[PDB]
Amino acid sequence: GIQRPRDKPLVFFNRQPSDPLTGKVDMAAMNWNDKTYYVGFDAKFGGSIQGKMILDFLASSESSVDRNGDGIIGYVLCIGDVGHNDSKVRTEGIRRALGTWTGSSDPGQAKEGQAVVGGKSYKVVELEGKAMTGTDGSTANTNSATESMGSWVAKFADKIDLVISNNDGMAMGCLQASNYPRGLPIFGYDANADAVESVGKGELTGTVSQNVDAQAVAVLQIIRNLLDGSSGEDVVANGISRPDAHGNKISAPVQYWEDVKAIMADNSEVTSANWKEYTRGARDAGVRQVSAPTKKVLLTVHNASNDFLASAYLPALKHYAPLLNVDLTVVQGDGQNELSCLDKFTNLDMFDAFAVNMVKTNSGADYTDKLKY
């Protein structure tokens, strides 16, 4: 077993060590030891994946998708918080995919695009892209999306061939319109439980997942690999992109970015073809019970009140950990003060490895200071 704390595995996850202003990765933190890694997802490519989902849908569709037969695929777009990078990325992704991108992710900025539908070339028009703001100033507002959808049906009628949304909340809001045209294709983003259920019902046409289960498995699997004596390629491949010695393997695609020591889950489209893999509580059948020696991990969460971490990430971790014979202890902070986590990152001698979700992305050395000796 590893004798010195400074040599024990350290997996940063979900918030990447980096300068908070520039995003430059903190390689001092990443190079703590050669058993230090980061697990996240391919976030910058999320909009590309949403775009590709829509293009693939159109490519395998028939001309009946063109409801008014005018040779144009018309769409309406629900934009979330206009100042938020997620809105910008997703808007850019779908506009570039459809050829309507002009250089701007703003509402009202689009040009005529093009796409293949059922083996024929069509023009594409963004009939309207609009931020869904509540009358209280709230962003990505569900009720505003419902109202906008109803007004869009009234205004554009059967020029609307599909609805695209920066997120699931707004797409589900559109589906609440009393005049939602039956079967009209609609796409969201986030793979929320209700959205995936809707995909299963053939209502929402598709959404996009960050593969939280793959990320949770990767954190634990990296640690399993290291504590069992893997070093180098096997650490980031075994159980991750190919089966490990027990036959376990993450089902979703996962990347490794060597320069920053980051294991990054792909974003995945969620459609009628795979929706059951993404429903609330669904777990990866590719990860089964192992008989490896039991090991102890202390894992931190930067904010106990973060719903994604509380409701999606942590339950995934707790499902997979026992399967990998990891005894997982979890401590959780307040989302504001690093000390809320640091002061709980204690009695480290009880553990074999560590997983850290920092409040501030530049706090790496405060954690490694505790593992020096």
Q: Exactly one of 72, 82, 304, 371 binds Ca ion (CB under 5 A); which one?
A: 72
**Residue closer to Ca ion (CB basis): 66 or 81:** 66
Distance CA 351, CA 141 (A): 44
How far is Cα 38 from Cα 41, in angstroms, rounded to an integer? 10
List of residues 6+ apart from 333 with CB closer than 8 A: 300, 301, 302, 303, 304, 340, 341, 344, 359
Segment interacting with Ca ion, rule: CB under 5 A, options 58-66, 89-97, 216-224, 275-283:
58-66
Shortest distance, CB of residue 159 to Ca ion, whole angstroms?
A: 6
Applying CB under 5 A, which of residues 31, 63, 64, 68 lies at the interface with Ca ion? 68
Quick check: 269 binds Ca ion (CB under 5 A)?
no
Q: Which is nearer to Ca ion, 47 or 74 (CB)?
A: 74
- Should residue 64 be labelled a site residue for Ca ion when binding is judged by CB under 5 A? no
Smallest distance from Ca ion to CB 149, Å: 17
CB of 128 to Ca ion, least distance (A): 14
- Give the Cα separation of 359 and 345 in Å (integer): 13
Choose between 66 and 190: whose C-beta lies nearer to Ca ion.
Answer: 66
The burial of 243, by beta-carbon neighbours within 10 Å (0-12 exposed, 13-18 middle, 19 or more buried), is given as middle
- Record the tokens describing residue 118, joined without a space: 């059922």
Whether 115 and 128 have beta carbons less than 8 Å apart is answered as no
Q: How far apart are CA 6 and CA 33, in angstroms?
A: 8
Minimum CB distance to Ca ion, residue 65 (Å): 8
Other residues' Cβ atoms within 10 Å of the Cβ of residue 348: 13
Q: How far is CA 351 from CA 65, 296, 299, 319, 371, in A?
A: 57, 5, 10, 19, 11
Among residues 33, 55, 56, 70, the one that binds Ca ion under rule CB under 5 A: 70
Q: Smallest gap, in angstroms, from Cβ of residue 194 to Ca ion? A: 29
CB of 184 to Ca ion, least distance (A): 12
Only segment of 73-81, 252-260, 269-277, 304-312 that touches Ca ion (CB under 5 A): 73-81
- Contact between 65 and Ca ion by CB under 5 A: the answer reads no
Q: With CB under 5 A as the rule, give the number of residues binding Ca ion.
A: 5
Instruction: Provide the 8-state DSSP code for 210.
Output: -
| List 14, 46, 48, 66, residue binding Ca ion (CB under 5 A) | 66
Residue 31 lies near Ca ion (rule: CB under 5 A): no
Residues of this chain that interact with Ca ion (CB under 5 A) are 66, 68, 70, 72, 74
